[PDB]
Design a protein around this ligand. Sequence first.
Ligand SMILES: Nc1nc2c(ncn2[C@H]2C[C@H](O)[C@@H](COP(=O)(O)OP(=O)(O)OP(=O)(O)O)O2)c(=O)[nH]1
Ligand SMILES: Nc1nc2c(ncn2[C@H]2C[C@H](O)[C@@H](COP(=O)(O)OP(=O)(O)OP(=O)(O)O)O2)c(=O)[nH]1
Ligand SMILES: Nc1ncnc2c1ncn2[C@@H]1O[C@H](COP(=O)(O)OP(=O)(O)O)[C@@H](O)[C@H]1O
Ligand SMILES: Nc1ncnc2c1ncn2[C@@H]1O[C@H](COP(=O)(O)OP(=O)(O)O)[C@@H](O)[C@H]1O
Ligand SMILES: [Mg+2]
Ligand SMILES: [Mg+2]
Lengths: 664, 664
Amino acid sequence: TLAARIAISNLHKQTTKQFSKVVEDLYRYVNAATGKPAPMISDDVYNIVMENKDKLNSAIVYDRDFQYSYFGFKTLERSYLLRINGQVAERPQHLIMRVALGIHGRDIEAALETYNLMSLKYFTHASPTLFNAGTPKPQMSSCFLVAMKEDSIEGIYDTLKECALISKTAGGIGLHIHNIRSTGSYIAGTNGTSNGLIPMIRVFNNTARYVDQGGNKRPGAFALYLEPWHADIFDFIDIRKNHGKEEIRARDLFPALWIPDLFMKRVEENGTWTLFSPTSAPGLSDCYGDEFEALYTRYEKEGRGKTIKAQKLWYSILEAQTETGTPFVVYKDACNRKSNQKNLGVIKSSNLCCEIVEYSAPDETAVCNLASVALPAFIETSEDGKTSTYNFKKLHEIAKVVTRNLNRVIDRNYYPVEEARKSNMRHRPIALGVQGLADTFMLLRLPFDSEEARLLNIQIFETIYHASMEASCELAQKDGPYETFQGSPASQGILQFDMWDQKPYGMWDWDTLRKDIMKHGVRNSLTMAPMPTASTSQILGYNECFEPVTSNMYSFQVVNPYLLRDLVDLGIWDEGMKQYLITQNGSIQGLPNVPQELKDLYKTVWEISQKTIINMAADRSVYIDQSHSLNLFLRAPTMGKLTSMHFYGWKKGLKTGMYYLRTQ
Amino acid sequence: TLAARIAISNLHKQTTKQFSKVVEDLYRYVNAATGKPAPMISDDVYNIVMENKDKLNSAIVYDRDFQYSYFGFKTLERSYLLRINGQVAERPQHLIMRVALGIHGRDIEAALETYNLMSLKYFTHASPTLFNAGTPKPQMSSCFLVAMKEDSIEGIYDTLKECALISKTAGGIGLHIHNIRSTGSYIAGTNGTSNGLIPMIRVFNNTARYVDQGGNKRPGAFALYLEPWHADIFDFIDIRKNHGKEEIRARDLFPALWIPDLFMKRVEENGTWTLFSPTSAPGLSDCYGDEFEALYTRYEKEGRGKTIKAQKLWYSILEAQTETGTPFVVYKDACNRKSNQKNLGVIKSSNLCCEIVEYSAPDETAVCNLASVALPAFIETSEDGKTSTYNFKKLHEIAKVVTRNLNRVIDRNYYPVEEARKSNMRHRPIALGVQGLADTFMLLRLPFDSEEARLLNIQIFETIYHASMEASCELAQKDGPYETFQGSPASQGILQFDMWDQKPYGMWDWDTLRKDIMKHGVRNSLTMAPMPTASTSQILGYNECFEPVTSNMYSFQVVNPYLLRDLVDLGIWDEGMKQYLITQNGSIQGLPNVPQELKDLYKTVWEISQKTIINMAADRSVYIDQSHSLNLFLRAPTMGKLTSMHFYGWKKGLKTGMYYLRTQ
Ligand SMILES: Nc1nc2c(ncn2[C@H]2C[C@H](O)[C@@H](COP(=O)(O)OP(=O)(O)OP(=O)(O)O)O2)c(=O)[nH]1
Ligand SMILES: Nc1nc2c(ncn2[C@H]2C[C@H](O)[C@@H](COP(=O)(O)OP(=O)(O)OP(=O)(O)O)O2)c(=O)[nH]1
Ligand SMILES: Nc1ncnc2c1ncn2[C@@H]1O[C@H](COP(=O)(O)OP(=O)(O)O)[C@@H](O)[C@H]1O
Ligand SMILES: Nc1ncnc2c1ncn2[C@@H]1O[C@H](COP(=O)(O)OP(=O)(O)O)[C@@H](O)[C@H]1O
Ligand SMILES: [Mg+2]
Ligand SMILES: [Mg+2]
């Protein structure tokens, strides 16, 4: 609580103050053990700082280093602040300014604006952008979607190499493997027999452990995508199980289902499902919707696969999620039907955290650059105040700033492999998200499940999508649309919510925007993909992304600051209530002397109906370009509950039915 | 014993008889599950059989199918005889003829000669040649030596792919990794820190399990080579240990030491040894001898590494061999100093079984094609007889036949990767070996450790080397020397034994041969590499390669046929002696009523002095081009014993000090 203004003070004492000097130290750094010059700032950002040192040096407000809570600062200290000899060289303000310069280059005024907005916590960029912006090979991208190059040892190992090269410089990976022939399929060149996915997965698994994001940084992180008809599907979904048969597990990877509607239809009808090897039943990953169903159905009649009962696979899916939190679930038809990149071809996968939906192929590895807007920063106490209100106007303004940021990142990025550069330069996607929706709702006195919260959620996501497309239309006016604009839904005036066949809420003028996009283009094929903010939310001191809090009382013991305020304000906060909190896993329900309104406001995710989560996810989804990383939380899980959740999500038209399933 | 002329009879009944018809069945075969034409004979060998069916069909003697003992036939049945639908289609004679045609093509008379000699068991070819000769992509090579392409993720994964592609089509691999920076070395592109060899080994390990020699054929089989100065050396040697720390072991691979003399010198002097990362101490793998010692010594003074006591590494080497049989030991200086390929550059590794010594680099993967001569087939009962004698003249004749065979294999081979083709076409090495030396010695009434045996060993290897170079000089006269002949020791008249600074035994006219090689060249850079014959020896029914028997009584219980003969001939073979054999692990020493001469003749390897093995290995080594796969066998092992063995071998100038160390 106070140990923050204590440990930040210590860094100040143990660090150089003047920004242009820290930059000098970074830039002139030599790796001692090898005596090699190891500059930690690009030449270009170095020169820019030296030619602007007074302006740059004087713009920085180090008081702002005290915006960070204790965990936030320590998060910054451990992994983000550049170090010289195991000693931290950057103060948080310094990091921020390096990033704003990393992103903006010669445009100093744009860099100053980003410095102010980030230092004041209106928004942040994703971890890799913070780690690497303004450094010599700035790999600022968070996400890569990799296509298995070919069903051959040559393509498998070309793919493995690619993944290694990517993991080297710190992305997370989604990799689709639908085209690999299954167990027992014939191998012609040697008259042999395939052992299927598992032994191939195990090679990728080891690669992930080996290539730890730059040498002792973080284990490689790959999610694998598979359509539920693949004949190896039962072992794939179990890849994370704790119990026996070590040679058949792949514990360092994450399995994801790329589900066609037909699977769901068959599950609900209590029908049959057919398992195929892709050699016997080709092209299934390369179509979707009615076209997929006609193709699948024919192959199924032609006897080309093995028939089981659908509900047998399902029950196994459900078992695996209950035990491991995986596999993830992303609906292939929804993704494909409702994607502005549909003119590129069929989208075969999502990504490590199920927010990105972008087209990939053997020659194109889809990329995304991310940032998240801090939703609390736009609450103003009103002019009388106390009403508090929500400044949608400023939100719109900042989302436009961040849009332009993520666009510069595209052009200034170092891409690990050529397949990533080719994709990104062509198609130009970007990913805006949010953090602290829970905090916003709290501050404003709205319960998560309330109709008021429902409305705010809709308006926030409408404003972010509108702002991002407005900014992207602006950039297309200056710089031209992205190469692949023509033929896109957006070129026809079909925007995300149109694809859900809905009217927009209408807080913004979508018609003028649409008129404008049709005439001038947009600069980015996609703009929205709300992400977990698993790390960045913790730097800023807010609840991750768009989920309710999991607990009003984490563990160092820290009680929800909004709840604490309230308890003291009511003459009820004593030792007998702090007790009823570490024991109650952070709940206040049923608790004796506590007003109903606080109970309704400080509900945990474990106490909110997942029908409420799904509904709200489905509401904002009309304003999301890509998808979003929808964690599901079940207290006492049953197959019946799990089933109704997936199905409710599925019939709502979600793209990401489920990220992790969390239990207790 | 009789179950052989029973199970062979059954195959006959269950197989088609006429050779050209089995060929027809093979050639017209369709993979049923996929309906793809899967011809199991090349077009070229098919056409040859059809244009010569009477001659081919009538030359075959199916009585010869009864040359094979019971284990031999079953070995053939399980893995070698081509199958159509899980049913064996080839009789052994058929296999033999396919191979002779696979090797010889249009030269029918050469094919007939090879058919007679193989069917009559004068010699055989190595497993891959038997599996694949005359099939559509005939990969007949047994050995590949792979250079780690570069100290980078790009080169590591290009290497991994290469190994996969090779393993696909059934070779064994030696891979040298001396150039990979060790644990804690700096990584510049990302300001990180290396985790060294182990996590990289684990990726190769998984690849070996995955790529099982054509799809369900046999696990991948890789040996790794490392010079004992590499800073990761303590964990490398322990890679096969059974006990804890699973993440640090690599149990599906085999570690091999590539030892400079200096290591040994330092061990014996009780001196220091210095551990380096190759980034801090470059070029050590790229020189040998005095040049290596001056370079190593300087780096060691310049403080570039970590200093320990030599005997600490050694003791650990010795511990690991005691427990796992590994690491193998091959002396880098001996290999390099005494190699006809020395004009190519520094040889950085041996192979999976430590018999091959060939140059490899990022663009050249050394290859070898193998065959073994059955030493027993050249015993004739003499003209009066009973003396038995040894027909050195026929041995010479057959070795010349096999030389020409292995040369055609080179030209007719399908190479899995371009690096293997480039090497093999340039340099053209080949590998002759032997099987049943133990049987030969027995039949002839010579104890393994006798002076008579010593002499025969010297003469056999002299005759094989002479014959092989004679034949290879013949081919150079027709076809030109191999591309890289000029500048070689052999081009200067320096033959293997010259490099040991020895005179040849002189049973053959080496001077005329030398005159001839100097004028005309040889077709192959190398010709001799006696191999384990771990499988092929068992097909023919003889003791593997050049080792004494391990036991006069294996397990189906089978007693040494030469010993059995003797016991019945002496009125001593009863139930009380068969007993003293299953219990005595197959020994006859100390046994009451048994003549001294039989005790001396039927000594086990466990009862022969390893000084005798080393001596005899050192004797024949002067006639070996490459090296040979020298297993060592110790009853009750101690550090002192193990040490004197390695050192005695080392001072004898051996190339392969040790293959496996076997214990009990
Ligand atoms: N376990 C195992 N799997 C293999 C092996 N070789 C290939 N595979 C798998 C990898 C691919 O999914 C599939 C086909 O591999 P390739 O395309 O390299 O085989 P190839 O072109 O020789 O035969 P094809 O014409 O594709 O049937 O079989 C092997 O040696 N062991
Ligand atoms: N554990 C781990 N090892 C790595 C990683 N990246 C590279 N290595 C190892 C593999 C090589 O032995 C060595 C050098 O790798 P690279 O040549 O790909 O690194 P780079 O060229 O970026 O840096 P350099 O100039 O070579 O120091 O470090 C990593 O992300 N994790
Ligand atoms: N452990 C990880 N290693 C590498 N990349 C990751 C990891 N966790 C998340 N990512 C990448 O960052 C993206 C967004 O994740 P998020 O948790 O919002 O990241 P952060 O908050 O660290 O910026 C994911 O889609 C994924 O590609
Ligand atoms: N398990 C194996 N897998 C692949 N190759 C092997 C294996 N064992 C031996 N080899 C290859 O064959 C060579 C000679 O071995 P040997 O035991 O004489 O083979 P074989 O008797 O089967 O022909 C070795 O140097 C190695 O490269
Ligand atoms: Mg193929
Ligand atoms: Mg490098």
